[model samples]
Target: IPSRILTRSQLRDVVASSHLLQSEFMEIPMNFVDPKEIDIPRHGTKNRYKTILPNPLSRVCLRPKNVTDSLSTYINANYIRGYSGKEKAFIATQGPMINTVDDFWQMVWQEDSPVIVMITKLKEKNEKCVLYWPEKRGIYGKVEVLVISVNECDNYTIRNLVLKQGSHTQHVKHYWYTSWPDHKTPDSAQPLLQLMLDVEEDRLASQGRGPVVVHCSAGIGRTGCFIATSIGCQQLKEEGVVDALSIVCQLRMDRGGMVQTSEQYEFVHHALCLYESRLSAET
Candidate 1:
């Protein structure tokens, strides 16, 4: 077990040891759940990409269409573990494709998720995520989604949304981060840290709700980084240390290819390192 607590200087040492971290990251198995294990004919229709699939163990199964249409239950998403190591604390899924937008909302409604963190743009050299939300209001399957308000920030946009199903209406917050460009990490980790802080506050305020949903293009890259950074920052704050390797390995076990690249891995370190400095300043 990782028992040592890192002070501010020790946290800096870990960040400086980027080469060592990269080597360690390369050795961890991706632990991708075999697609064959999740047997459902024509399930490919639901996936945005052919190869980027969910880990069968933690794969989220939607509600029944007579409880036999397995295809109806399939969604390219997984129940990601959060800082508490509790199941379903977060969901990492591919950016909703044009066809799967309704399915995406269904998952949101079913999970009772309070917040959604989107880390990719609608278009990044290629189509990343479909424009899932409407300008004002739209119906997806049974849920009517209405955009109540929108706040544009320097690195992200915050939208207060409402989901109506029958007489019941649920409020949700969508944080769309646009700073991360195509196929790479961001220029700085500050904006990401800021985003994480805001999301955590919201998550706390909305406690006892469902997991916070996070997505990027593939859902494994920036999605993983955001979740890992969230968990790592919590560790640094409460325990005065971070075990990034353990955190990432746990995430991969839940959903394959978490913290997608060595660069993303290093970015998590940078974000956590920056967080530790802030913590020290507060103390």
Candidate 2:
């Protein structure tokens, strides 16, 4: 087996050397090899390059109750495995389009997802994500979603959600991060680090929960960065080492072109380096 561990110097050296890091990061081509060649009439993908097509091996199957013709089970989403190869540890999905809001909730209720991490906001005229939840209460299919409470942190907004299906109900946490600019990494990665820690704690508290849902505009850009950071932090915390290159490669294998840009890729390195410093401080 290829050694997965990376000593502190090895990781830092990669980040410190800009040219070598970009070479490896950019070489990983973002290719949708398994998805349909064209936007076929029934594929139902929002963004071709940004969305993740479910592979046969570990497809995220949404329990289908509707029989409408051409209502493809496809939802531009994929199952992302986390630390120690944990299966379905998180769900990487595109921002809910106006046409697929119901399908989004269906996946949530069916998957029993406890946390949804949104990492985008458009100050422009375009609205990246369709507002899927309600101020107080809203019903999406068999799931009745109610926003119990909302707390706004400096870098993100948190909403407590209660989804009720008949007599059964489940709690979900929504973290909306609007500070990051579109198509570019944030100016500072510190806020994102805190966001990752916060989300991890929430994931721990919500026991017996399904995968944490993560998305951005295309679901590949910021979405990939956040998931990578989460997993990288875990490796750092547990093994005292991490291979960011390996992490990005593993992510692309799961979903093509995760970490959409070279700059975003560098941002991931910076985030991990910052995390390493934090670890040192604690020690």
Candidate 3:
């Protein structure tokens, strides 16, 4: 039967069944491009390893007008598919190499995105992500990113920003979170759910805004976890159940290597389960 033609109750059952899927089930059909193959000149210099290039088709290419070289517009980023077959709900990109900071803002300006979610920090021992945005105000190419206000949450920091170019100005929200352990999921799942909930609220309020920009060190591991959590929560919010496996599948189609490890996959399930319990409590 065509999935689109399924009745609402049937759809809900399929979503519930997704939670029973093993993380290993997702690895069977892995066909993403090898990052090494994309290591041409000027692809990504700041990358610690050359094995994480963005998928070409979904990669967020700068406007053709910005190409200084053949790879000028190629950032290690892709348009991540969101919940329930939605398109361009999120742009998953790298932590921002020093060279691509300008391009990052360019994409931000071009997309008219109202939210920026940074999953990694400036640096930790080794350089993870460069401080792309200025502390107060600065210009990245033609777009000017100005800090309007900042609010520090329990596990993340939220910044209110204004983007000005020519006479046009726009408001943007930036969320910076870095509480996850090194090379692992967070110690507890509640904090991540809270962050996801806050981000969803912002996303809902900014309905007409473009895709929310989300990034991590490699824009894969932790990045995938966050996006999956967000989508899962949205599903649970509307349908009272979440198809985590299906959601992750959609994510990987847009950008390979999402939910990088089994533990991360399991964490996504944990996040979804927590969201379900929360919904139950509310109702």
Candidate 4:
């Protein structure tokens, strides 16, 4: 939708002409209308009673009992069907603390999908990279976070293909911290692009299969930006630059607004520019 700022007068005119304004009451106060007088629209079939009604009055009414029953039935029946297995591979969710490694394992296990843990923390001077192992369970303390920072001998490594000793089913990839997080600089965007490329490669290698689970503390803002920018870049590559932003805008409607901040939008543009520059240099 094109962003427009309407004046108060214009807004009043628009609201007055709309269907919302046609109703008898502007606010629909609970005391004004009887509890049995609100109509809740039904799904699938036509309203049988609606057809046979003699006079179409100004106020449409229904028993509150019917409305409540209809609403509950509609929600329970269609909710699960609406979100079957065919949804997007990536998800944005929240977690307060790392808490237990088993909890993280349970989340991955529940989906039975490939997981990409994007840790936003910078690596310490002498501290090692950590990946929580759930296979040890209670025997090995609460959980074991295997450190691979030293073995890799690099600040960041993409797709090291680390294999857990006991858990053969679960395959994990590590992308460590190498560059500082700067919206203006190419350093920050490079790691993000690398992570996306690694994910795309893994997805392709697995024969167009599995989901990539991404999570951060509050998955709505920064995490959304990362995912949006990644998808936006991909769209720019396939379609033209103009089409990419439109795609991202459409995707944001279902979820809350994506690429929330102006800086995030600029960062996405910067990423696209860098990607185009790299492609030109190679050619």
Candidate 5:
């Protein structure tokens, strides 16, 4: 039997059930912590927040090694799951501090990531993220990052970048989303959904590249919101029913503290709610 796609009305049925959504959200165990998680004594040097640490099980380890030293390979990032249990579909990581910018690009280069989605700005009152990219071209570790072109959009700016290491060259798309205000959710989910649509289009075009690198300040709040929305929309499109609760739980399992706040949790719901409407309108 063929899998039946949900009608517009059917998707709305799942979107409208806020009570069920709330119940599922409330049941998530956000306080769970891993044992002896921060094994590397010098891991704190590369980390942005003291409390926000990556899960050791799924964390991305930099291959350029000082084999005896574990801290040398540490990057505050994790391999997160995507739709249908795809491994390393996206990498959730903290905003790179000035010191870790080299490590950041190194990870991008090593992973062969096609897209980088930055959800926060360089400064949000205090410093939310460092200006990680070069204006035209610059070197990070052994990789040379050259900005080919920058196109400004409504809520975000897209930069076409090329990464070079020795003889090998790779293209990467960087989306810096500025419309999402400091310490608050966007007033509308339209911009986010639109960004997701654009990213998905590019992700398809790239084909056979690595996971999409996503980050905000802490790499869990808006980061989680963006990732959860992408996954939920796919599930709704294919399965008719979206399990946002499971989506978020899976994210947290990969990196602790994903979808950091109750409001962000709700924002993911709102984004999906808006997405279902868009799907309905087209049908």
Candidate 6:
């Protein structure tokens, strides 16, 4: 059956029956630890020497900063960085801080490093109609896809394009009753994901590298889902589905309670199943 046809109850049942309900079953917590405390393990050598295991991607370090309870704290704290300091940071939520493209540009320009911005709100009245990134200095024009509105931007321009919910994903097709609540709508995420994919593609095409930034509210849950999906998909492609789930679980441990809500787990499961179905159809 098509995913879009699944009723909310049916979706809930599928998630429950999959035995993906337990916290331990779905998430792995990666604790912040000093390297000096642990010994390295060696796998292959003439002398059978073991070396310390480097982290899978890189160390996940969160800088501790004093934040006010006001809106500025929420707005200012949106940027999240991984260990290498080179990975693109992600902005997970939308609010007064991102009410305008001008504000968005200010945040982007403030970052000396390369980053990808993910806005999760539907286009509002007086919202910046254009997606402009000050970092690019308007080099890349408007965007190309539309989630809610018609496309009216550049293919590679920073203020490239705008998207509306119905235009991007099948998930939006059945929005007659689906309540997104804290979840980002397809319209909001597609452009960001596309931009990230494009940036990663360009990096790989030019420098043989593949790293991208992802974010949404709180930076951990939605961010976790994106990271898990990206890593899990690669594992599925290379090692198969079972291994992919295992890898996702392993990565989840490093980050606390990833895929936290039942809804999120279901969403991830839906995405995985959808990908596999597509692959099977192609075959």
Worst 10-residue lDDT window, candidate 3:
1-10
Clashing pairs in 1: none
Candidate 4 lDDT tens digits, 1-283: 4232222233224333434322311222211122234343442132112221111111112212333454322210000000112344554433213332343434343344354545344232422123444322222222233433332423355443323335544454544434534333233466666666666676566543334545433333345455655565554454434232343343343233334444555455545555544442221
lDDT tens digits by residue: candidate 5, 51-120: 7888888889887754678877889899999998899999999999999999999999999999999999
For candidate 1, give the lDDT of residue 131. Answer: 92
Candidate 6 lDDT? 0.34
| lDDT values, one for every candidate | 0.88, 0.79, 0.77, 0.38, 0.85, 0.34
TM for candidate 2 is 0.90
Q: What lDDT tens digits, residue by residue, belong to model 3 across residues 50-142?
A: 676677778887774735675766677889888767889999888888787898898898888989999886776678898888899999988
Q: Which stretches of candidate 3 lie over 4 Å from their true place?
A: 1-30, 35-41, 46-48, 64-68, 281-283
How do all the candidates rank in terms of lDDT, highest first? 1, 5, 2, 3, 4, 6
TM-score of each: 0.95, 0.90, 0.86, 0.51, 0.91, 0.43
- Compare candidates 4 and 5 on TM-score and give the better one: 5
Decide which is better by lDDT, 1 or 3.
1
Which ranking of candidates, highest TM-score first?
1, 5, 2, 3, 4, 6
Per residue, candidate 1 scores C-alpha lDDT tens digits across 1-283 of 3233456677788777878778877877887777798788888998887788888889988884565678889999999998869788899999999999999999999899989999988898899999999899999988899999999988899999999999988889999998786866877899999999999999889979999999998899999999999998998888777878888889998999999899898889899988887885534
Predicted structure 6, TM vs. truth: 0.43
Model 6 lDDT per residue over 1-283, tens place: 0112232333335544545434433344443234353333321120111221213233222222463322221121222232222343333222222343333333333332233434233333333123333322232212222233222222223322222123431101000111133444232333323443454443344342222333333334555555545544443444444232343344433433344454555455555444444343322
Best lDDT goes to which candidate? 1
> By lDDT, is 2 or 3 better?
2
In TM-score terms, candidate 1 sits at 0.95
- Give the lowest summed-lDDT range of ten residues in model 5: 1-10
Query: How well does candidate 5 match the true structure in TM-score terms?
Result: 0.91
Which is better, 2 or 5, measured by lDDT?
Answer: 5
Q: Could you say which candidate leads in TM-score?
A: 1
Q: Clash number for every model?
A: 0, 0, 0, 0, 0, 29
Off by over 4 Å in 5: 1-23, 65-67, 280-283
